[PDB]
């Protein structure tokens, strides 16, 4: 039997997938899971919650007049 310890929050991540699989009853669960994470990532991106990549291009812009 498998008993594993996982990072704080990963339980919730799996639970979100699981509850949506149960809600939708996909005929092909693995295909549904790939779509689930794709859409979750789009939602995270739109909210501004993508992790900051401080070595990556500072591609966004902020303006304020004085």
Residue numbers in the entry: 7 to 72
Question: What did the published study say regarding this structure?
Answer:
By combining bioinformatic and phylogenetic analyses with structural approaches, we have discovered that the docking and dimerization (D/D) domain of the PKA regulatory subunit is an ancient and conserved protein fold. In solution, SPA17 forms both homodimers and tetramers and displays a weak affinity for AKAP18.
A construct spanning amino acids 1 to 75 of SPA17 from D. rerio was expressed in Escherichia coli, and the resultant protein was purified with a sequential three-step affinity, anion-exchange, and size-exclusion chromatography (SEC) protocol. Crystals of SPA17 diffracted X-ray to 1.72 Å. Four copies of SPA17 are observed in the asymmetric unit of the crystal. The two central copies of SPA17 form the canonical four-helix bundle as previously observed in the homodimeric D/D domains of R1 and RII. Interestingly, the two conserved sequence regions flanking the central helices of SPA17 both adopt a regular β-strand conformation. Alignment of the SPA17 structure to the D/D domain of apo RIIα dimers results in an associated RMSD of 0.482 Å. SEC coupled to multiangle light scattering (SEC-MALS) verifies that SPA17 tetramers and dimers exist in solution. Homomeric SPA17 bound AKAP18 with an affinity of 9.6 ± 0.69 μM, supporting the notion that its AKAP-binding site is not blocked by the terminal β strands.
